[PDB]
Amino acid sequence: PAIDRLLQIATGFMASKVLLVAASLGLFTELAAGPLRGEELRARLRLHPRSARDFFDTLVALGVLERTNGAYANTPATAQYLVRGKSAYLGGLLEMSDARMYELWGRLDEGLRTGNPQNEIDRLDAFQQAMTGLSMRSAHALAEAIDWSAYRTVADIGCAEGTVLIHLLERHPHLRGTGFDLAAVRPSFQRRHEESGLGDRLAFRAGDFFAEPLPQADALVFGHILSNWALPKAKTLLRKAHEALPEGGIVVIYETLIDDERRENVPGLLMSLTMLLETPGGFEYTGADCREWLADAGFRESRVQYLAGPESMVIATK
Amino acid sequence: PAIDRLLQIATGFMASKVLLVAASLGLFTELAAGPLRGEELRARLRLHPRSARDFFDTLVALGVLERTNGAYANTPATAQYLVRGKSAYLGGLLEMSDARMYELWGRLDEGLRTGNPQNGEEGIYATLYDDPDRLDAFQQAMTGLSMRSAHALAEAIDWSAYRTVADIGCAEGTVLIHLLERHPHLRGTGFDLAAVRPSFQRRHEESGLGDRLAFRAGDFFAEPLPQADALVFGHILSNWALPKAKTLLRKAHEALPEGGIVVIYETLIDDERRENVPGLLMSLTMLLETPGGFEYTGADCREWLADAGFRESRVQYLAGPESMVIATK
Ligand SMILES: C[S@@+](CC[C@H](N)C(=O)[O-])C[C@H]1O[C@@H](n2cnc3c(N)ncnc32)[C@H](O)[C@@H]1O
Ligand SMILES: C[S@@+](CC[C@H](N)C(=O)[O-])C[C@H]1O[C@@H](n2cnc3c(N)ncnc32)[C@H](O)[C@@H]1O
């Protein structure tokens, strides 16, 4: 029935919490060495004997854990994506949802009634690990979705620790890259930079993009940037991208974009409510919204293109 | 789409909260008289313009609202089951999840680490000042959602060999009343704490069962159980620690005549403890809500029944996530 599906959505916070706590405990990382029986897994996770077995079996029943002859083990998906240290690890997103977003979303009604965020308005490394997991599939797709051989240089605006840019340059040996972010991010960028071995091919530029021009490059990337800010400041960033680009250069913007008709992309619409809860004036937008802003900024051509999972990009040519 | 399935589960708290808040706002009730535009619905709910349309459009994208030419409307399910005032209203489940259970599950980690329930700081009588209309709506929904299993309990057993039935911890008596309506030969007794009698009496009066049904005030951990040919335990044993569950089975055996039956129903976990998500989640609910409760399997229960001296037990599916275990003295 339609009502059974409706109630399953309504009570989805229970199974969500089961998986979020398992991620917070690093349960899947503890199983990366091999299968463990319930008593051993409980001891490693420091869980109480009352409900540990129920907890593990719930994960099995949800399809996010294997159990064979009394030993729990990762599924192919949890092995690939929820084991810490692996390149495709996105568990940082679940750890952040468990530590912060679950309780923040508990304040949705107040956000809806006031229109004001419901948050405070390590730590940095927690935010960066959540962002890496959010942008993980999109960063790989970004390296394949555009013919990068046509550009010499790329500047990632709001680059954080530089994961997207580093993968782009590793994937395309000809590229030179510049990451742009606040000065407090430089150490995290410098660490990833040194670990990549990319050397002189990659550089960091410290600054505030609401007070300083952007680095000049053949391509400029905006990953999960514009959705954080009220529309006039996003329009300011699009103008600065135009000024930083040469003729034929491109601006690339990717988000969990809402469908143009605003009736299908659930992660995008949910993201817009996260922006409500987290920011004074951010919101999630549609590809059509962005193409209007880009034409207004002076770009001559633009298209919307699917990326990965719920995320999409808008590309414009100066 | 394997990782996409996992991410849908892990972030299900968001879609949940959207629906839970829509229920606490009575959004679907506001749409009962007919479709409303965004600004009209916004104003009727006293929501800020910044995110009202995003909220409304999320519900459309989840498939719980319709939108035609900019007019938001109930889907057939929300119009039937999420409009306050209707006898079929189930929104009390969402209201109570929003008001209470969502935050409770926020403490799952502490419950798993401590083994202790997670459910003083406020003033005197704080607990007594909860929204009684929301509490009533929640109970109305649990009464309704249980009707399938009450229908099944009446049909799964040949009740003709038994004269009398007692429901132990009967609460408002819904199952016992339905069984008596379906099998008019049965005389019935509901057994529960004295404070439960008003809610039972209301259902008793509404049923017309009259002289064929009685309520008996009692504490089943402190007094003998009513003697009847059949004893029913609906969602009782799972609320209590194992020594107490065994104690109740012993008292059932003592209360029953030779040939009498004990009838237990629960959201049982599958015997292999790997399939039944409602049952496993219920066991974690018991962690968070009770000091000693636990969900169990049919096989677990048949062992306790054999140890209590019962004969000829079996496990039988009832309806949806509910199953019964029945045994003969
Ligand atoms: C949501 S994170 C996005 C990280 C990355 N682009 C991605 O998609 O995963 C936003 C980034 O913008 C940066 N940022 C915020 N305000 C900034 C400012 N005023 N100037 C430069 N960078 C800023 C933050 O440091 C943060 O790393
Ligand atoms: C799960 S609720 C009842 C559910 C009911 N059997 C049904 O399925 O609709 C547990 C019931 O046991 C009753 N109860 C709890 N402790 C009791 C006690 N010590 N003696 C008698 N009844 C008790 C409560 O009042 C409550 O009605």
Residue numbers in the entry:
A (entry chain A): 12 to 132, 148 to 344
B (entry chain D): 12 to 130, 135 to 344
Authors' account:
Among bisindoles, reductasporine is distinct due to its dimethylpyrrolinium structure. Its previously reported biosynthetic gene cluster encodes two unique tailoring enzymes, the imine reductase RedE and the dimethyltransferase RedM, which were shown to produce reductasporine from a common bisindole intermediate in recombinant E. coli. RedM is a homodimeric protein with monomers consisting of a largely α-helical N-terminal domain (α1-10, β1-3) and a Rossmann-like fold C-terminal domain (α12–16, β4-10) bridged by a long interdomain α-helix (α11). The C-terminal domain possesses a Rossmann-like fold typical of Class I SAM-dependent methyltransferases, with a β-sheet of five parallel strands terminated with two antiparallel strands each interspersed with α-helices.
The movement is an approximate 12° rotation toward α11 about an axis aligned with α15, where the loop regions around α15 act as flexible hinges. Helix α11 accommodates this conformational change by developing a kink at M157 or S161 with 31 to 49° changes in the Phi and Psi angles at these residues. The overall length of the monomer is reduced by 2.5 Å and the central binding cavity volume is reduced by up to 60% (estimated via POCASA), and likely represents a closed conformation of RedM. Chains C and D have more open conformations similar to the unliganded and SAH-bound RedM structures. Upon closure of the active site, residues F153 and M157 from the interdomain helix α11 are brought to within 4 Å of the SAM methylsulfur, displacing the solvent. In docking the substrate to the closed conformation several poses remain in this distal area, but higher-scoring poses occur near SAM.
